[PDB]
Amino acid sequence: GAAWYLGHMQSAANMLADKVKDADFILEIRDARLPFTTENPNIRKLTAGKPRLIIFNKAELSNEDSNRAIQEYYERNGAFALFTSARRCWRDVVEAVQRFTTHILPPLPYKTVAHVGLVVGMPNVGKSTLINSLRLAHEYQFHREDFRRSRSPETVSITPGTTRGMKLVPLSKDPPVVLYDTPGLTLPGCFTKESGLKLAACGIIPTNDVSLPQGMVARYIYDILVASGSSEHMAECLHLPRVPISFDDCVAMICERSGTSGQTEMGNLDPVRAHRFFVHDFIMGNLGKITLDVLPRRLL
Amino acid sequence: SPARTAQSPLLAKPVKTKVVDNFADMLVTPALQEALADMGVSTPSPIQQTAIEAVLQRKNTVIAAPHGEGKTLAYLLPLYQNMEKDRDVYKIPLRERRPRMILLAPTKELVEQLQTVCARLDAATGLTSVCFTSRKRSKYHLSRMLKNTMADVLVMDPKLILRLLRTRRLFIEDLRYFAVDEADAMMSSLHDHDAVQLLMKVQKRNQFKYLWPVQTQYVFVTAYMTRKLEYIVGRKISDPVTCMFRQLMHRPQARLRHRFYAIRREPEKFTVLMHLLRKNGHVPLPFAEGRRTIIFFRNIDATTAVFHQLRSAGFAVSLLHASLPYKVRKEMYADFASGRTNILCATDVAARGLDLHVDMVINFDVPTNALAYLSRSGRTARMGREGQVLNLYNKHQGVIVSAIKAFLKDNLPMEGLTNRKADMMQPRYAEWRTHKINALARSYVSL
Amino acid sequence: LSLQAREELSRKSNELQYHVVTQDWFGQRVDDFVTQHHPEWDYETVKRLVQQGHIYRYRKNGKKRYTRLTDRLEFDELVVVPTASFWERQLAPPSGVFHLSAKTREMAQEMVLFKNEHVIVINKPSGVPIMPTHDPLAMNITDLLPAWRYTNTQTPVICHNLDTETSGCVVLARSANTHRMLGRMFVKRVVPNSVYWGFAVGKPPVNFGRIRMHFEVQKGQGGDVIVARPTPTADSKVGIAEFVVNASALEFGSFISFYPLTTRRHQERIMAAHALRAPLLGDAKYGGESAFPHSLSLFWDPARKDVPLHLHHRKIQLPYKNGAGEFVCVTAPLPPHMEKTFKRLGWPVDA
Amino acid sequence: AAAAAAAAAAAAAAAAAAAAAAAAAAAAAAAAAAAAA
RNA sequence: UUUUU
RNA sequence: UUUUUUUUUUUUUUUUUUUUUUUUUUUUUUUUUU
RNA sequence: AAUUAUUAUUAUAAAUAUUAUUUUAAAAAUAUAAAAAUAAAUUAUAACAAUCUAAAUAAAUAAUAAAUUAAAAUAAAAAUUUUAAAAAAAAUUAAAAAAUUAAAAUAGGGCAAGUCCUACUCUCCUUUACAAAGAGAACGUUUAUAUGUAAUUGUACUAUAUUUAUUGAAAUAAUAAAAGGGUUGGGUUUUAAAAUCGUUGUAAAGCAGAUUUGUUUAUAUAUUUAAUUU
RNA sequence: AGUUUAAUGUUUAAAUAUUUAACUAGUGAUGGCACAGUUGUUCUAUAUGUACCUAUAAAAAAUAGUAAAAUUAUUUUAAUUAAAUUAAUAAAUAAUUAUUAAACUAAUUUUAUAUUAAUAUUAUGAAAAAUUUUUUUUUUUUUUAAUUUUUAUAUAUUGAAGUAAUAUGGAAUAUUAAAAAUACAAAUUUAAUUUGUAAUUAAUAAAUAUAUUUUAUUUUAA
Numbered sequence A: 001g002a003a004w005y006l007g008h009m010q011s012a013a014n015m016l017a018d019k020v021k022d023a024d025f026i027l028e029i030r031d032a033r034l035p036f037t038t039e040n041p042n043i044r045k046l047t048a049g050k051p052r053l054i055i056f057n058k059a060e061l062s063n064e065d066s067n068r069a070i071q072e073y074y075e076r077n078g079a080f081a082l083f084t085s086a087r088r089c090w091r092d093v094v095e096a097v098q099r100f101t102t103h104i105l106p107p108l109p110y111k112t113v114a115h116v117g118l119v120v121g122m123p124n125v126g127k128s129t130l131i132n133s134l135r136l137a138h139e140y141q142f143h144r145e146d147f148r149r150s151r152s153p154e155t156v157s158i159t160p161g162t163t164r165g166m167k168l169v170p171l172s173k174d175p176p177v178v179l180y181d182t183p184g185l186t187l188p189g190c191f192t193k194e195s196g197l198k199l200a201a202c203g204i205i206p207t208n209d210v211s212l213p214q215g216m217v218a219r220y221i222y223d224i225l226v227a228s229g230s231s232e233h234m235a236e237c238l239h240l241p242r243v244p245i246s247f248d249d250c251v252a253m254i255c256e257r258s259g260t261s262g263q264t265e266m267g268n269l270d271p272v273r274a275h276r277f278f279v280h281d282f283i284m285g286n287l288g289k290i291t292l293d294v295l296p297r298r299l300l
Numbered sequence B: 001s002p003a004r005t006a007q008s009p010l011l012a013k014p015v016k017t018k019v020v021d022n023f024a025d026m027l028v029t030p031a032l033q034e035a036l037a038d039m040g041v042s043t044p045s046p047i048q049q050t051a052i053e054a055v056l057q058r059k060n061t062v063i064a065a066p067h068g069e070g071k072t073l074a075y076l077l078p079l080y081q082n083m084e085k086d087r088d089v090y091k092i093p094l095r096e097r098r099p100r101m102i103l104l105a106p107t108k109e110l111v112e113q114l115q116t117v118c119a120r121l122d123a124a125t126g127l128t129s130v131c132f133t134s135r136k137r138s139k140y141h142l143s144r145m146l147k148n149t150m151a152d153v154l155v156m157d158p159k160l161i162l163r164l165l166r167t168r169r170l171f172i173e174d175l176r177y178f179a180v181d182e183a184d185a186m187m188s189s190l191h192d193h194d195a196v197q198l199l200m201k202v203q204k205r206n207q208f209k210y211l212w213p214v215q216t217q218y219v220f221v222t223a224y225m226t227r228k229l230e231y232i233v234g235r236k237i238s239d240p241v242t243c244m245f246r247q248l249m250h251r252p253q254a255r256l257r258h259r260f261y262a263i264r265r266e267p268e269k270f271t272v273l274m275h276l277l278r279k280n281g282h283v284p285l286p287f288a289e290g291r292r293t294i295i296f297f298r299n300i301d302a303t304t305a306v307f308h309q310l311r312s313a314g315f316a317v318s319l320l321h322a323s324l325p326y327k328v329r330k331e332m333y334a335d336f337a338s339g340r341t342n343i344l345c346a347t348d349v350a351a352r353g354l355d356l357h358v359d360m361v362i363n364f365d366v367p368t369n370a371l372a373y374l375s376r377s378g379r380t381a382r383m384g385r386e387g388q389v390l391n392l393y394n395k396h397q398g399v400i401v402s403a404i405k406a407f408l409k410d411n412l413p414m415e416g417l418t419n420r421k422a423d424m425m426q427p428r429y430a431e432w433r434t435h436k437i438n439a440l441a442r443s444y445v446s447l
Numbered sequence C: 001l002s003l004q005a006r007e008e009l010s011r012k013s014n015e016l017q018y019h020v021v022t023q024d025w026f027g028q029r030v031d032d033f034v035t036q037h038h039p040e041w042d043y044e045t046v047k048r049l050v051q052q053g054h055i056y057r058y059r060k061n062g063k064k065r066y067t068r069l070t071d072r073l074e075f076d077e078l079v080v081v082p083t084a085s086f087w088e089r090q091l092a093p094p095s096g097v098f099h100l101s102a103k104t105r106e107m108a109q110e111m112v113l114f115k116n117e118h119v120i121v122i123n124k125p126s127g128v129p130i131m132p133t134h135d136p137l138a139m140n141i142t143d144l145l146p147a148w149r150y151t152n153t154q155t156p157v158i159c160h161n162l163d164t165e166t167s168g169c170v171v172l173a174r175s176a177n178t179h180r181m182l183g184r185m186f187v188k189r190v191v192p193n194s195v196y197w198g199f200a201v202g203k204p205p206v207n208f209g210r211i212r213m214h215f216e217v218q219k220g221q222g223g224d225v226i227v228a229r230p231t232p233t234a235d236s237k238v239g240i241a242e243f244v245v246n247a248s249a250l251e252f253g254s255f256i257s258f259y260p261l262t263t264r265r266h267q268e269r270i271m272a273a274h275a276l277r278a279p280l281l282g283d284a285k286y287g288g289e290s291a292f293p294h295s296l297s298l299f300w301d302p303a304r305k306d307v308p309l310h311l312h313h314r315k316i317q318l319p320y321k322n323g324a325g326e327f328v329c330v331t332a333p334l335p336p337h338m339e340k341t342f343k344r345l346g347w348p349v350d351a
Numbered sequence D: 001a002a003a004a005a006a007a008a009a010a011a012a013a014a015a016a017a018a019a020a021a022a023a024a025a026a027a028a029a030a031a032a033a034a035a036a037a
Numbered sequence E: 001u002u003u004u005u
Numbered sequence F: 001u002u003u004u005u006u007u008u009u010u011u012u013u014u015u016u017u018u019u020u021u022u023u024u025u026u027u028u029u030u031u032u033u034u
Numbered sequence G: 001a002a003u004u005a006u007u008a009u010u011a012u013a014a015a016u017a018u019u020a021u022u023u024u025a026a027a028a029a030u031a032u033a034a035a036a037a038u039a040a041a042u043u044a045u046a047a048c049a050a051u052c053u054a055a056a057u058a059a060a061u062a063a064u065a066a067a068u069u070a071a072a073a074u075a076a077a078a079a080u081u082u083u084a085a086a087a088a089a090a091a092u093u094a095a096a097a098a099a100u101u102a103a104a105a106u107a108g109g110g111c112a113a114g115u116c117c118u119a120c121u122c123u124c125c126u127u128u129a130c131a132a133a134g135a136g137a138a139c140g141u142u143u144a145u146a147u148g149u150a151a152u153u154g155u156a157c158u159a160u161a162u163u164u165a166u167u168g169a170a171a172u173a174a175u176a177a178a179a180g181g182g183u184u185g186g187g188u189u190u191u192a193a194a195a196u197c198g199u200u201g202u203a204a205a206g207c208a209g210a211u212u213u214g215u216u217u218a219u220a221u222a223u224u225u226a227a228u229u230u
Numbered sequence H: 001a002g003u004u005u006a007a008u009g010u011u012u013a014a015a016u017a018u019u020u021a022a023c024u025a026g027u028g029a030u031g032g033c034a035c036a037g038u039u040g041u042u043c044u045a046u047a048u049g050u051a052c053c054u055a056u057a058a059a060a061a062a063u064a065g066u067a068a069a070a071u072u073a074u075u076u077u078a079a080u081u082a083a084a085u086u087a088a089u090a091a092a093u094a095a096u097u098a099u100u101a102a103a104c105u106a107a108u109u110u111u112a113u114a115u116u117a118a119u120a121u122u123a124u125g126a127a128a129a130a131u132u133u134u135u136u137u138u139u140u141u142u143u144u145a146a147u148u149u150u151u152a153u154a155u156a157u158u159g160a161a162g163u164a165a166u167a168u169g170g171a172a173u174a175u176u177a178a179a180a181a182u183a184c185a186a187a188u189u190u191a192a193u194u195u196g197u198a199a200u201u202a203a204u205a206a207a208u209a210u211a212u213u214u215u216a217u218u219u220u221a222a
């Protein structure tokens, strides 16, 4: 029974505060295709004053018009924002944390202590892989905890479960900007009817099951893109009469790599092999490089 | 233990637990209560209640208490009460060199206190007591035998009494009472085996039947019940009325609190002492500032090493061990006692049953025994006074402090028949035991 | 305990010391001595202190003789029996130191499946809570309780707090003396003692097994997970159930039977929402977001909150037996909301 | 465990099976208040 | 050193 | 010894925080106990 | 390969020799092997068929304290019970099943020490050494010297102290041996080729003209529905 | 048709057999020669070195100093049965059972009584509280022989309008006390309430209620 933290996030607030009461610079790993669904609910009232380094991953597939406003929004509030294609990997995102403190850090009173970094975000959007990439390499090349790297028991090699107490990853050394873990507080599974669509749309929570069939997100990625064009160019990419009238033809027109047991005279193709295609291809930013969220021009 | 001490002499025989709970009903004379209340004693403690009329009667007794439970009054008070009823009622003549009662005492600083606590009993009018210890030209200081002594109560270390006998200067002929103090250690090779060999010459005189029948009242007072103490009392003495209180004995006091410091390095045992000596104490008459404290050492080689290290670090430290001269040891005691010097680099001289004002015992080496620990610790908190004992245990004494730490949180008797000191006791746990290395395995691996 | 006997030694209190005079009381049983000197404590309040150790001891000699209620006194030792007077302190002294209209006093009598001189078993309606949450407002069982006082017993005491959305069978004890006995029947079983029925949507893994999850309640409502296979050992307790999928909708639902060996919070539903990730039908608190009712041919109008959680406390094996030697097993029949989906599926609802 | 309340069987059909466990000083040595066949 | 139950 | 001096270690004349548990409430509530 | 035994001992050469060892007239389990259904070769199939008697001859194996038993009920002993006691009435024989009897004081959690392990600053006897002395040192050798852990080791005035400074460490994750089920608590369970080889029950002793005076009952459900009739 | 796995086999056709199961494409290799146990090969598995890596062969002793297991002889001629315990300057004995020996007196029936020495023998394992059934393990054959009785019961009537009274097996008594039952009268707040009388209650005082021997140990005679 290996589930995760399960409960409304708006009750994980007064405990998140005392976690920020001691931290210095707040981080976050989001998805630029989902500027405010991958955010914790308090992002508004979370800190308002600690220097946030809010990062949007997979930005190369998120649209560029909505990228400007979301950039200058926090950039007006003061809290910074950085967008990355992730092809140039987190190694450059790490470089940001080397630069995005030297300019904004308050000078350390004691020459070598830390810059205690509070990280948040969904573990499946890039926050896990960002920790366990810097957490694994610290075991070999050593900065603190000062022991001979032998006491890690059998079958762990990593510990993001059952201890996660004072556990923290030293990302840098001379400006030792360390980073916390924040035991995963996001995607509560009590999500909204629609948020699970935009979440499974982006490849996040890639589970497509009885809880969320392909034909429920595929109906969503089709009806979101009612403007046929540069998306019908993916349809026209597979012999489609450009405009699809509705969900029946376009999904059935793309059954060239789909099908099941059908007669030699009347073929009864398979619309689920066409479902996953239309679903999973939009995940790759292949069909269109367009966001999902609405980007409130107002403050909210 | 109940399911024990049956297979052990001196016990399996009833223990007089008849509480009498007040001095009046113990029939102690109002000429002695006026002197007791004069001292400050109003209510009889647990050991006193039960063993004062067990010696007000002529029952040969084994007084056993915890620490600072009143044993010194317990045995001494009724013996003065008894001596007074000898010289007045029976009119048994004093004679010259023939004392009515002897008292024994292990250490020189213990002999003297047993004299002033008995000196304060001149309300027991005719009784005159003289104590004696080593001196210079001291054999020429039995002049106080040729001189006025006639001392009905003669408190002395056993060895000097024995020489006054074998050279025909003492004559236990009329020894009516024979008391022993801190007998746990005194009746053993630990001191000299000289408490014994003195019982017997007394034991062989009251069964001589050609001089008057002076049935000498033997009184043993011992905080510890050792295996040695049992047999040389259970097997030789006649009708030993025991006074053991098995539900408060072989345990450190309640209001006393213990502290265990784990020390990894030989030279680190020092800072932990000075850091402990930052409690800033100073009294009227009982560069750095320590409280009332005794520091107990493994050896007198070291008891002066640290002493000089303390002094040269700025404390008013004192020093008391055996190899000191006569003037220095007399002085260095009369400074610690009576206000001055506030801290006493002592060896196991100060462990053996001494009373004062001390309030904090540093075990500069937690001892390897349960007597050498109850005797040091038991000097801290006496008769309801609060008190702290700090233990600088090491890697080598870890076991004994693995268990002391565990027996205290439970308040258990420290292996209720203590050992390792008087009864050296290769039987760790007292019976025909050599504990096994248990099993029922029966697999017996093959290759 | 060794510290409990310490403060007992170091407490003056008023320590009502009670002599045992030569004539009237020497020889009497101690529970006569206390009960005719201290009329304030009920006799049962006097047995607790006399046996518990916060006792009225007796002191003759140098030790305290804690005693059983029948130990008789001694021949005038002026053997004092000390009794406690100001327990309140570090001691923490022991226990003992609207209106229900009709249509309720009747409503609470159709919810009775079994009654004898020692318990009462009811049939709780799915959705009525037990403890009050809107402190003046909600109609719960504890406010109803002075309705099952059949034969004028003293306000039955609730024994195991069924949850809000959980339907089913409850047990009240009809006697504060029986309630002490009926404790060992609930907490941390070794073998099952109760059956929970439910309709989880989505055929789980193998239709027999045991679930061991390690719950952790972070306030508010954190509700954590397996995190330690052994335990976090500090803030975690485990909840074990031996589930059996009795029958199963072919691949989209199942009718599961949980035998909850433990007593953890929503342990039925949180372990069901992660036996597969197939939660119970209408479980909007832990699962419940797959769809509104998880999108079936059931009553599907409001849905968003229509479908009530198909969970039913089905059977409890009481320890009271019956005229024939069998132990009694209440069999609270399913609510219509489960009788809906059982007959809509044609299963033989076993009452 | 602690073997209590022995039973001395005399014969059968003449001991009534309640008098077996009798000859033990207790509430037995009375008549079974509610027998079962 | 001091807040809280 | 040796017994003398006025003394002298005297010489001498051969629970939790911090800058009570539990019974599967939904904050505040119940009920049992210590 | 223990053999006249699961076998073309094949380095080579080869292509129309009928070229010279395999009992049994029955039935089940099993074992191999087998027509039909929820464009391919597959399924699973614990489904027909098909092969495997008996008797005759030949004969081994593990096992063996013996019983006077052994049906069946039922209480009594630090005990775990092999017996004994009351109360019963339990027949031969062959066959087939394995319910019981003939193969470890164990499995799982929670704790603590130990061996294993790594690591050296301080420990011991290493030898293999190196330098030093000695010879006008072309070298061969014999003494005096502290290096590496090389590498093995081990290290919790009569009194009233003394017999232990003398290698120091690491959840050393697994083993071992222990305990245990205000500090404190997770675990709940018992086996892997069985000639049956003692009881057991199941069937049977092959034609009886003929059930059933009395033994003994694996015999087993009483209702979830649909559609009527007042 | 050469390559890391699964069933059958279960003294089996084999002291590892048949089928199941996980990848590499011989211009670089089937043995030439070569290595060997306080150690070879080593693609580093403390895997393999001729059907038990404790390798095999030979010779030997410290090797149950170890709940180890055995230890060969009927008809006899002395007893006990859990007791002991002090590390360490001048204090009468450890205790057990055993073998072999030794001595009767202030000390009563005209009773009774296993004391002493020498040597042999020291492991049969309690933790807590409370406290100052019983004699059996072991019999030469004939008789003889003193410890045996089962089960304890209780109902009906009338009036109540929901309680008592009468009858039975403790009974009715008597007074002091109360009747919280209750019934009656009288006074009234009608009525309920106030008031008293007696059923009745309790305390206490007095007089009342059933029978053996005989089956187990107390001796002879050979």
Ligand SMILES: Nc1ncnc2c1ncn2[C@@H]1O[C@H](COP(=O)(O)OP(=O)(O)OP(=O)(O)O)[C@@H](O)[C@H]1O
Pocket: B040, B041, B042, B043, B044, B045, B048, B065, B066, B067, B068, B069, B070, B071, B072, B073, B223, B353, B355, B378, B382, B383
């Ligand atoms: N009856 C009494 N009541 C009160 N105080 C007492 C009484 N008797 C003695 N004391 C005080 O308590 C002190 C401790 O008791 P005491 O000096 O007798 O200890 P002790 O008997 O030498 O100790 P230990 O038992 O360890 O040998 C005494 O020195 C005296 O000050």
